[PDB]
């Protein structure tokens, strides 16, 4: 880890590995020098704690007292973050072709629709914009298409509308309890930063407009577009999963 | 905030945090259950492999959208390969059979 940007301070694992190397080289030297039984036993006792702290800092007093690193961070702690390694491996973490913005009403839009931002739709569908311009022949190559999108010409928004014509965007709330929270909709253009979510859809998701964010997700590939349009669509998911009654109703 | 592709972390080939280098906006474990409940396997596969974890998968997927072919070549996520290396370092002998 760099403190300034070249200094390169030793990380949590490197401190633990250094303690084992320092203990191993120190003990190995004492065996050649032929030290008494008190020192060699005490040196091995330090190596027992050093190797144990490197593998798993638990059920024993060890590591620094919050100077830079707060607890210890052993190999076991690297695996078991919170609930194992579920955040990185199981969940996925971060994920490309995604964003987030403030919620909004917009009743003018249809039931199976969502008023997505203009700047966000350009950024989210960036490779689709390059492919459209390269196909249409406006840009000579992907380098020219990259310069055109960065410069933000008038022709870019014309191609972006055709790119986001029949392609659903997976919207989702922060507390995804049920399957109804994560839902897809037809992304419509809108001059504004805040994303427009439907009134009937707000009942299922349970997201009141009072500084409530809603993360977007561009569905890449052919299979996910068919899956989001058929299974995860707003128009398809009318009735509730738990109860037989209608989810999307007048509130 | 919005982002298509950019920066990636050193430990586990994944995108950045959010609102600094690259706009991540994490998926989470709960959203995987929502995708699994609805039954969107291909949508769930690309989220935790193609457009997130796999370095070789992301490079191959980027060329497919530009050319206008779509589809996906996922392979191994790499984050799972780190779990094999981390498990290997702590005395356990884990390896992919066959």
């Amino acid at each position: 880890v760099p403190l300034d940007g070249g200094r390169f301070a030793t990380s949590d694992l490197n401190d633990l590995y250094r303690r084992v190397i320092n203990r191993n080289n120190r003990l190995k030297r004492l065996l050649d020098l032929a030290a008494p039984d008190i020192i060699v036993r005490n040196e091995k006792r330090m190596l027992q704690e050093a190797v144990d702290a490197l593998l798993d800092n638990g059920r024993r007093g060890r590591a620094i007292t919050g100077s830079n690193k707060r607890p210890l961070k052993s190999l076991a702690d690297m695996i078991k973050g919170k609930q194992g390694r579920f955040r990185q491996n199981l969940l996925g973490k971060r994920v490309d072709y995604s964003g987030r913005s403030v919620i909004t009403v917009g009743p003018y839009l249809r039931l199976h629709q969502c008023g997505l931002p203009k700047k966000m739709a350009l950024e989210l569908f960036k490779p689709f914009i390059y492919g459209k311009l390269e196909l249409r022949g406006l840009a000579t190559t992907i380098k020219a298409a990259k310069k055109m999108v960065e410069r933000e010409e008038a022709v870019v928004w014309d191609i972006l509308d055709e790119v986001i014509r029949e392609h659903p965007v997976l919207l989702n709330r922060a507390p995804t309890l049920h399957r109804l929270g994560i839902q897809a909709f037809e992304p419509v253009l809108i001059e504004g930063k805040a994303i427009q979510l439907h009134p009937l859809v707000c009942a299922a998701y349970n997201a009141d407009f009072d500084g409530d964010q809603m993360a977007v997700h561009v569905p890449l590939t052919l299979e996910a577009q068919l899956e989001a349009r058929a299974l995860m669509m707003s128009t398809n998911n009318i009735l509730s999963p738990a109860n037989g009654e209608p989810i999307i109703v007048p509130s | 905030h919005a982002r298509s592709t950019g920066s990636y972390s050193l430990v586990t080939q994944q995108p950045l945090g959010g609102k600094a280098q690259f706009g991540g906006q994490r998926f989470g474990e709960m959203e995987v259950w929502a995708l699994e409940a609805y039954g969107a396997a291909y949508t769930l596969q690309e989220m935790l492999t193609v457009k997130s974890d796999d370095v070789n998968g992301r490079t191959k997927m980027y060329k497919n959208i530009v050319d206008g072919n779509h589809q996906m070549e996922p392979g191994m996520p790499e984050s799972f390969n780190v779990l094999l290396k981390e498990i290997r370092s702590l005395g356990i002998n884990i390896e992919l059979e066959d």
């Binding site: 299979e223 899956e227 299974l231 | 699994e36 609805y38 039954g39 969107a40 396997a41 291909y42 596969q45």
Partner: peptide, 19 residues
């Protein structure tokens, strides 16, 4: 093995018998 993947998993499982 659920929804879309269930069809692929069922077909892949049948191939494991012979090879």
């Amino acid at each position: 093995p659920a929804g879309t993947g269930y069809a692929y998993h069922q077909d892949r499982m049948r191939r494991r018998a012979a090879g």
